RNA sequence: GCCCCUAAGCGUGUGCUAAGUGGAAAAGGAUGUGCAGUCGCGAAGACAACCAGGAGGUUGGCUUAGAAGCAGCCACCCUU
């Protein structure tokens with residue numbers, strides 16, 4: 001429902017300048033052509049109206065759509081509050097479309113999102129849980145898709161994407177390795193990143209780099225030339241090759257807000273042992289006479305909990 | 314969706330919504346059918362909605378039989394126009410369902426799941442309906 | 450409280466009752482506390 | 487009070503015992519070394535004990551033997567149990583020897599019926615999912 | 619076996635048939651190689667009972683007027699809306 | 714739509730036998 | 737009880753009633769499985785104690801042909817119906833009322849032909 | 863049309879409604895109530911209720927630091 005209003009608003013805002021002439025031209029041409037569009041309905045509906053024609057009607061529907069999009073932002077803030085309050089470490093996956101942006105999120109975690117071959121299909125951001133291989137959990141978000149000279153009426157349809165980009169720690173621009181000029185996508189994606197960090201002033205987040213579809217690539221560089229951006233990980237989502245290296249380096253590059261301490265716990269208070277073993281990601285220990293030499297990257301709630309039962313060894 | 318490939322006459326009169334059905338009042342292809350108890354013009358979009366709901370509830374097994382076909386064209390005068398100056402262009406495809414006619418049939422091994430799928434499809438239709446079974 | 454024209458059981462422990470001329474789903478879980486209009 | 491099946495290991499076992507005994511009150515060393523004295527005769531499988539705490543220092547030891555549910559597992563050479571119980575059977579054991587060596591474990595079974603207690607043991611084995 | 623009881627019809631037509639159906643009496647015709655159409659009004663709900671118990675391919679006893687005649691149902695007539703038995707065709711059977 | 718709805722329900726009456734002028 | 741399944745157990749208990757030698761109509765209240773199984777293994781096959789539905793067993797003991805102890809089926813009757821012995825197999829059976837404090841024997845009638853409120857403290861005990 | 867306004871029944875005989883329904887309304891929701899069925903259980907005591915037991919192999923196994931009926935998996939057995 002959100003998309004069927006944003007797309008319609010974008011089409012109305014693109015067609016409003018060009019009403020006379022062209023607009024009446026597709027008013028005359030009503031067969032469901034390429035310009036026939038359809039709005040968010042897709043299966044015509046307002047497709048028989050295409051982008052509408054009347055400026056009065058366009059203006060009215062535009063005002064209603066503005067109000068509705070206003071509502072579906074105080075909906076989205078509510079839906080994201082739980083993540084915000086818990087401050088789970090968020091990782092987002094951006095890049096050019098058809099660059100394995102959804103296959104990666106179906107690969108690292110068994111999400112199961114649509115992976116159609118065509119262009120922009122994951123048009124609504126979806127996020128899924130995940131565990132960094134060694135320690136902390138995380139959340140993973142795949143975005144919509146970027147294009148060279150992106151339309152200027154689609155920024156609202158991309159607004160939720162932009163919000164996910166800003167509210168992130170590790171940004172991931174996935175580049176389609178087996179494609180001509182694997183850098184043209186990169187410059188456009190980066191430029192989108194700068195306009196985002198400018199429109200919403202924030203410290204830019206680290207940008208993790210991954211080259212995808214290198215299984216079918218003919219090595220366009222086949223060398224440090226293939227290291228056209230030398231910092232990157234060459235994953236193959238179709239085969240799951242760099243998953244281990246990606247799953248390792250992505251966590252190591254997210255930064256840890258833990259608190260590694262060494263604490264001992266007398267057996268009576270096994271509650272603390274269980275809480276460290278289920279919340280804190282203990283490295284290891286030896287099972288001591290009365291307690292344990294637990295070396296756990298314990299978090300803030302339990303940091304002061306385990307301060308009393310500390311140890312010096 | 315569903316559409317006739319060719320129609321002899323594109324602009325027709327309105328289908329007659331009178332009398333109970335005379336043919337198609339029985340489950341003949343499946344095991345559970347959705348009979349109709351009211352008169353309705355059931356459009357192709359409603360048929361696709363019901364079909365998708367049925368095919369997504371069971372989601373694996375059994376066939377779905379859509380007896381009716383939306384071949385009658387319904388026209389629509391263009392907006393903000395005064396009355397007159399010819400009949401409008403075709404806009405809707407309808408099937409002139411009649412009470413007693415079975416609109417959908419289904420055959421799934423699990424009986425209650427099929428019953429619930431038919432219930433979940435009845436909600437997409439503009440009229441009353443009931444679950445009818447091949448075992449009379 | 451969920452004032453909807455359609456009130457249904459949602460979980461295994463929802464009971465539908467007629468109280469003061471109104472249909473209510475009373476459940477141990479407060480999230481399922483639904484009252485018909 | 488606790489029918490804990492303390493492991494047969496006579497080489498440094500409290501941590502495993504220390505939790506289960508520090509949630510209550512019993513001498514850790516006394517309990518450990520008395521169970522270790524029992525294991526001096528019981529090195530097969532760690533025999534079970536029911537420590538009967540009343541208010542302090544229960545000092546009670548009764549034997550119920552360790553992997554009865556898998557005495558068959560222990561006395562076949564096959565380990566890891568069976569992670570696919572009845573999906574496919576895992577391992578091979580002898581059908582006569584279960585009926586025979588059910589004698590040792592019949593000391594705490596339900597009934598004295600021979601073939602039926604053998605079926606008890608066959609049930610505990612087939613719980614893994616294995617042929618016997 | 620099925621032991622149905624049948625009665626002949628004194629009035630035929632639309633009005634009489636609806637009146638018979640209003641009193642739980644499904645009208646029926648007895649015909650076959652007997653070469654004589656017998657207009658019968660069969661009491662209802664027991665016709666339905668035997669049809670559900672055995673099926674259409676059954677053998678109705680049909681004690682008409684104290685005279686037994688074995689028959690088999692050949693053609694029914696259910697209303698599409700109010701599923702009932704509007705009329706049943708009975709084929710004569712001679713032993 | 715209250716006014717027209719009332720003026721149309723007015724026909725459903727014993728004395729009017731279910732049909733009124735301008736119904 | 738179970739209209740079809742009832743008669744099978746009624747007949748089984750009845751035939752064991754007429755086959756046996758005596759009766760002790762007893763109270764099984766509060767019998768935790770431990771002590772109850774200790775009893776089942778103490779008397780063993782002889783007097784094989786197994787509770788049966790009192791309402792049905794009234795007709796079951798009559799199915800065997802005998803009456804009597806049927807009079808006092810009020811409460812949760814428990815039956816042993818000793819197989820071979822009379823005195824030596826009833827000592828512990830009666831004295832479980834002293835040891836476990838359970839199995840107070842209402843009794844009332846021996847073998848189906850001899851009434852006695854002393855059903856246990858009779859020859860069965862002495 | 864017949865309780866008063868307002869002429870004539872606060873009629874008689876059987877039932878139903880608690881909503882002022884009567885004295886506006888839909889998809890749909892619903893332990894409202896009556897009537898006619900059918901099917902299951904049950905005086906060998908059913909259903910509710912109260913008093914007891916509710917066992918052992920056993921903590922079934924895998925799993926995990928740990929999962930012992932009750933993270934979660936397979937089986938979903940053996941005896942009394």
Ligand SMILES: Nc1nc2c(ncn2[C@@H]2O[C@H](COP(=O)(O)OP(=O)(O)CP(=O)(O)O)[C@@H](O)[C@H]2O)c(=O)[nH]1
Pocket residue numbers: 096097098099100101102103104114115116117118119120121122123143144145212213214215216235236237238239
């Ligand atoms: N051969 C091969 N194909 C891949 C690889 N990674 C992704 N693809 C292909 O990319 C295609 C596009 O699917 P998707 O994963 O959605 O790419 P995308 O970038 O997310 C397209 P969108 O942005 O609209 O979600 C898929 O058909 C998938 O098969 C890879 O490593 N090797």
